[PDB]
From a paper:
The mitoribosome is essential for the intra-organellar translation of the 13 mtDNA encoded OXPHOS subunits in humans, directly supporting the formation of Complexes I, III, IV and V. Indeed, without intra-organellar translation, mitochondrial respiration cannot occur. Using comparative sequence analysis, mutagenesis, biochemistry and cryoelectron microscopy we show that METTL17 binds to the mitoribosomal small subunit during late assembly and harbors a previously unrecognized [Fe4S4]2+ cluster required for its stability.
To further clarify the putative role of METTL17, we also formed a preinitiation complex by incubating the METTL17-containing SSU with a recombinant mtIF3 (the second dataset). The map features the complex SSU-mtIF3, where the initiation factor occupies a position on the SSU that is similar to the human counterpart 77 and mutually exclusive with METTL17, as a superposition of the two states shows clashes between the factors. Comparison with structural studies of earlier assembly intermediate states 56 suggests that METTL17 can be accommodated on the SSU in the presence of RBFA, and we also show that METTL17 is replaced by the initiation factor mtIF3.
Numbering used by the authors:
A (entry chain S): 9 to 87
B (entry chain I): 140 to 263
C (entry chain Y): 214 to 318
D (entry chain N): 2 to 114
E (entry chain G): 150 to 247
F (entry chain J): 52 to 154, 180 to 202
G (entry chain X): 1 to 55
H (entry chain M): 2 to 120
Write the structure that this text describes.
RNA sequence: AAACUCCAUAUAUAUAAUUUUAAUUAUAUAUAAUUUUAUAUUAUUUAUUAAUAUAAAGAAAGGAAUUAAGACAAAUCAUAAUGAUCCUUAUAAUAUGGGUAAUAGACGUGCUAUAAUAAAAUGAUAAUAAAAUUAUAUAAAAUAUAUUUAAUUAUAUUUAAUUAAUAAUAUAAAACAUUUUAAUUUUUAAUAUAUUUUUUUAUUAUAUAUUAAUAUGAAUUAUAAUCUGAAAUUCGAUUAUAUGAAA
């Protein structure tokens, strides 16, 4: 849990183009902190193999992009 | 020739001996007195809370039946209460031989003139 | 009064028990540079301690808490043999040796 | 003609392997950029500065290449390159330490009690 | 202290039968003599078990009460001793004596 | 210890002729370093070998000597030093309270440069 | 403990000035630690030895 | 038996300890503040309380977030995790550890308690 | 970054230093033990030194010390 | 080593002890705390058509 | 091979201007034991002897290292190194992210616990250690916040001394004393009572449930804050409030 006094984990992202054009933002920065500006924008977040499409809501601010792109498949046994 | 010189009382009538047990060491000053004991400047009951430790210190004086005939000023460092109490015991026995060398055999027979060699052994 | 102000301003660098004021510096790359730096600080501290026109810090008592902490980390053998226990009459008395007495003449 | 790393670096004088080369490159670039990283970290962590300058420094820190990261330096055996159980007193792995120790190569090392 | 030693000397069994796995056939129950250190262990364990049935929260109090009752004649561990001696008297012929 | 003691004895002889009162060599506590290794190269972490290194220490003190003579001692014993012996020298110079002519960090400079760069000045604008 | 805090703060400030120390009475995080840490670059960059060996 | 807000207490129970034991959301520190506010001495027991004092405890307890209200806050925070599709929300739904614990072994308690409608 | 001197010391036999002896065999005597140890090669490695009596030499040394 | 399976041949000739330490108060010393002082042991390996082979020589100087 | 040896232990000498102090120490050298002596008894191959006891002398009671051979063609080509064979725009090299942390069952090894011969608090002229560590550092005291008089614990601020027998990590802990402790009506309270008064006795009230989980236990989980780092989402550590499973 990053200390609040340090601020957000800001990463270089192309937000201006996604706000003037509406294009999805494809990114591997799973550590990135979802800033309040991101709300409404569409992100494609790498999960190690694919890019998961996700739109950001107001209940996602503060969390990190990686939290919404699971990297493992649900476990199953050959019962 | 030999390297042993007769031990004698010092200028103040005190017999000084050193004793060791485990990691503890004790330097005692034995003089003729009335049974007063000081451990590191503190009363015996203050420094040693366990009565068994106090009894160990008294045992050498009990063997020669001279518990009320000497004043002991014991200084000890290292280890814990048991090591220090028995290191003082060993040192008093070694210091009492100067006052009467004829009692060494009785002290040896009681086992107070033998240095205990047991120490913490690194497991092998 | 100036000695008291000097000791108050030194803080942890003064040990009341020993009366020693010790300060070290390795900030610079050359020892000569560091020697001057400590010298300059000493002159500055002495000037402030000797300028009692505004404040003398006489109300402020000397704080020794730093020294107390250091003392607790060391062992203190501050006990001496009681003087009223000494028995000078039990000390061995030098014996008369004619040979040594005769070999000296 | 085609160096594998963005900046030209001199080779270590002894045993060489790909992992040693990668670790050595990171070590050299950490030294070249150590002051830069400390200066940006200062600006980003100094609460007396405005938040905008603090966030700008944090962004610049996130954009530095991985070969400038102190936490990516890993001590490896200078004789074999193995990166597990490396004694820092000799910069050798346990096995190479034992072999060198028994050959009399370590200045004051002898067999224990 | 004299009361404790008298109680330990009266409660401890003099002998105890032990099973020896001698031979492929059934083991033999032969009476064996006990030394004083072994006798005190048997009697002390009986005392502790009897003491731990008392109401006091403090073991010292329960032990004190148990020792007081034993010094006054009343103890349930004397039955154990009689049953160990009965078995030994039965197997007296099983003894080897060489 | 062997070279250490021999070299220490030589220093005492050098000082005597130089007129330097010397004390020692006082033996200081020996430091012991220990390393435990597994004898096998791959597995078998149940058999472990022990290794150790002992640092032997000696202290020689100099008294009532002028600085120039003390430097001659250090120079001579340096010229004729033995293998595997290290030497640390603490010099004590008593001085007057007030002397005549006496006896900025890299990071700070870069911070000022960075805070003047356009990527930072563009924000500091008030 | 009975010494007024104002008096003890005046001593702390003056002492810090004489000894060229940073006086931060409020306690705000200033990053001074970062500015004082030692540079480990030279030691880290020599791990594998001197590269300018005769070959 | 002393009844405060439905909860039953044995007479000998110490008030500050009993309150932090039977009431959800009240711990040791919170229980001590309630007793200090009502003038109950540190080690007062339930049987000593009078009816006016039992009503005062219920009043102070009714102005706090405890029992259903406190439990609802936890159930709603867990539901929000599932609604946003966070990794943690899925763990709660799958009855798996949500705090990084390994699952190759152990993880038995998370299998019994981790759920969106957490008790 | 210090003055350096090199002192080569010549040994006239290869069996006076264990290190030199091992290197010679390993690097120069391969044609003698690559098809098994030649019966002549082994014989040479057994007549290098006369079989000195260690006991009398040891006792001669101890007598000199006593003298 | 291999000089298709590794083979080891051992040649042993002479003394591997020192009697100066038994008949006299002189005491032996262990080099590196595991090697006797009289004994000097060294190993050298090389590569042939088959591969690596080691030459292990041990001399006892008294 | 044993041993000789080195270590430990006991003692002696040397060194330290006894403020780098632990001289009750440090570390170089040497000495000492594989103990010795007599005495009675019991056996013997009875002798110039063993097993015992007894008195006497002594500090004397413990360890180490290494290998001689051979077997498992036992482990390792992943510490590094070699032959053969295979890849050579890829089976080599670099970057970003992910994984190695998945989870039905099973197994090994640990930790914590299931309460009264045992757990929890408190103990400042500070009960009592050893062995280590600090230039790719160890961090004192003080102040601020959590937070309350203070202490305690955690973090921040600041960075004293020491690169070390000097200063720091670091006032060892258990022990011991006092207080408290569910199950337990074995308690607590109200009156009265006492030559048990930190307590006794008497009369009332103090629960019901209950083979059971408490003021035992601390898994699980919510929320907030902190630490390291460029970065803590998968996937780290710490603190506070709340949660309080199995046993
Ligand atoms: K509660
Ligand atoms: K996991
Ligand atoms: K398991
Ligand atoms: K990973
Ligand atoms: K318990
Ligand atoms: K995380
Ligand atoms: Mg400083
Ligand atoms: Mg402290
Ligand atoms: Mg210290
Ligand atoms: Mg690392
Ligand atoms: Mg002293
Ligand atoms: Mg793994
Ligand atoms: Mg507990
Ligand atoms: Mg103390
Ligand atoms: Mg502090
Ligand atoms: Mg204490
Ligand atoms: Mg305690
Ligand atoms: Mg609890
Ligand atoms: Mg249950």
């Amino acid at each position: 849990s990053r200390s609040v006094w340090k601020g957000p984990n800001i990463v270089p992202l192309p937000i201006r183009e996604a706000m003037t054009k509406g294009t999805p933002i494809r990114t591997n920065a799973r550590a990135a902190t979802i800033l309040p500006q991101f709300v409404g924008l569409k992100f494609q977040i790498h999960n190690g193999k694919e890019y998961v499409p996700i739109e950001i809501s107001e209940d996602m601010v503060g969390h990190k992009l990686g939290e919404f792109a699971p990297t493992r498949k649900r476990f199953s046994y050959t019962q | 020739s030999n390297n042993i010189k007769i031990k004698t009382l010092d200028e103040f009538g005190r017999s000084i001996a050193v004793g060791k047990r485990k990691s503890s060491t004790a330097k005692v000053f034995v003089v003729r007195g009335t049974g007063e004991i000081l451990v590191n400047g503190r009363q015996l009951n203050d420094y040693f809370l366990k009565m068994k430790d106090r009894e160990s210190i008294m045992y050498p004086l009990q063997v020669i039946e001279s518990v009320g005939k000497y004043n002991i000023f014991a200084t000890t460092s290292g280890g814990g209460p048991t090591g220090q109490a028995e290191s003082i015991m060993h040192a008093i026995a070694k210091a009492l031989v100067v006052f009467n060398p004829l009692l060494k055999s009785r002290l040896h027979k009681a086992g107070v003139l033998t240095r205990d060699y047991r120490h913490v052994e690194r497991k092998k | 009064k100036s000695l008291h102000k000097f000791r108050i301003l030194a803080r942890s660098r003064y040990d009341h028990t020993t009366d020693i004021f010790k300060m070290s510096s390795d900030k610079f790359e050359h020892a000569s540079q560091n020697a001057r730096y400590l010298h300059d600080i000493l002159q500055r501290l002495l000037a402030e301690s000797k300028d009692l026109t505004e404040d003398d810090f006489s109300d402020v008592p000397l704080d020794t808490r730093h020294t107390i902490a250091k003392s607790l980390r060391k062992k203190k053998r501050d006990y001496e043999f009681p003087e009223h226990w000494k028995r000078p009459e039990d000390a061995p008395k030098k014996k008369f040796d004619i040979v040594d007495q005769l070999l000296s003449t | 003609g085609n160096f594998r790393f963005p900046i030209k670096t001199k080779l270590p004088p002894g045993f060489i392997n790909a992992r040693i080369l990668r670790d050595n490159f990171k070590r050299q670039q950490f030294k070249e950029n150590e002051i830069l990283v400390k200066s940006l970290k200062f600006i980003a962590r100094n609460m007396n500065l405005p938040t905008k300058l603090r966030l700008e420094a944090q962004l610049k820190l996130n954009a530095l290449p991985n070969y400038m990261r102190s936490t990516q330096i890993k001590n490896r055996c200078v004789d074999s390159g193995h990166a597990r159980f490396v004694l820092s007193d000799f910069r050798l792995c346990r096995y190479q330490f034992r072999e060198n120790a028994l050959k009399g190569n370590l200045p004051g090392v002898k067999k224990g009690i | 202290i004299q009361a404790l030693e008298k109680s330990l000397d009266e409660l401890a069994p003099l002998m105890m039968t032990k099973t020896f796995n001698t031979g492929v056939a059934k083991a033999s129950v032969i009476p064996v003599p006990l030394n004083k250190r072994q006798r005190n262990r048997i009697a002390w364990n009986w005392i502790v078990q009897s003491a731990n049935q008392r109401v006091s929260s403090d073991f010292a109090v329960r032990l004190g009460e148990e020792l007081t009752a034993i010094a006054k004649g009343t103890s349930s561990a004397f039955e154990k001793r009689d049953q160990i001696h009965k078995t030994a008297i039965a197997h007296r012929a099983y003894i080897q004596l060489k | 210890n062997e070279n250490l003691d021999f070299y220490s004895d030589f220093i005492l002889r050098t000082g005597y002729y130089l007129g330097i009162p010397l004390t020692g060599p006082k033996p200081l506590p020996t430091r012991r370093e220990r390393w435990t290794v597994i004898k096998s190269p791959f597995v078998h972490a149940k058999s472990k070998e022990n290794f150790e290194r002992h640092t032997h220490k000696r202290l020689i003190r100099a008294w009532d000597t002028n600085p120039e003579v003390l430097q001659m001692l250090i120079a001579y014993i340096t010229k004729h030093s033995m293998a595997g012996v290290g030497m640390k020298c603490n010099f004590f110079q008593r001085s007057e309270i007030s002397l005549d002519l006496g006896s900025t960090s890299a990071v700070g400079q870069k911070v000022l440069e960075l805070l003047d760069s356009p990527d930072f000045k563009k924000h500091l604008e008030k | 403990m009975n010494v007024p805090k104002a008096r003890l703060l005046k001593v702390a400030e003056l002492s810090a000035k004489i000894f060229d120390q940073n006086f931060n009475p409020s306690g705000i995080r200033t990053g001074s630690k970062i500015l004082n840490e030692r540079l480990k670059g030279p030691s880290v960059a020599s791990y594998y030895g001197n590269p300018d060996i005769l070959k | 038996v002393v009844h405060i807000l439905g909860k039953g207490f044995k007479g000998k129970e110490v008030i500050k300890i009993a309150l932090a034991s039977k009431f959800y959301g009240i711990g040791k520190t919170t229980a001590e503040k309630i007793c200090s506010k009502l003038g109950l001495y540190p080690w007062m027991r339930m049987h000593q309380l009078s009816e006016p004092q039992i009503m005062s405890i219920a009043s102070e307890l009714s102005t706090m977030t405890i029992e259903g209200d406190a439990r609802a806050i936890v159930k709603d925070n867990i539901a929000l995790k599932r609604k946003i599709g966070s990794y943690s929300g899925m763990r709660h739904t799958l009855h798996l550890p949500v705090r990084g614990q390994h699952t190759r072994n152990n993880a038995k308690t998370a299998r019994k308690l981790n759920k969106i409608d957490r008790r | 970054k210090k003055k350096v001197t090199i002192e080569p010391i010549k040994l006239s036999y290869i069996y006076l230093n264990s290190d030199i002896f091992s290197k010679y065999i390993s690097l120069n005597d391969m044609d003698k033990y690559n098809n098994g140890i030649l019966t002549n090669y082994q014989r040479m490695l057994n007549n290098i030194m006369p079989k000195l009596n260690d006991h009398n030499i040891s006792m001669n040394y101890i007598n000199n010390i006593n003298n | 080593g291999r000089l298709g399976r590794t083979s080891t041949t051992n040649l042993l000739n002479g003394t591997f002890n020192n009697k100066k330490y038994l008949w006299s108060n002189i005491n032996n010393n262990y080099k590196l705390n595991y090697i006797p002082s009289n004994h000097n042991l060294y190993n050298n390996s090389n590569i042939n058509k088959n591969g690596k082979y080691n030459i292990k020589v041990k001399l006892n100087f008294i």
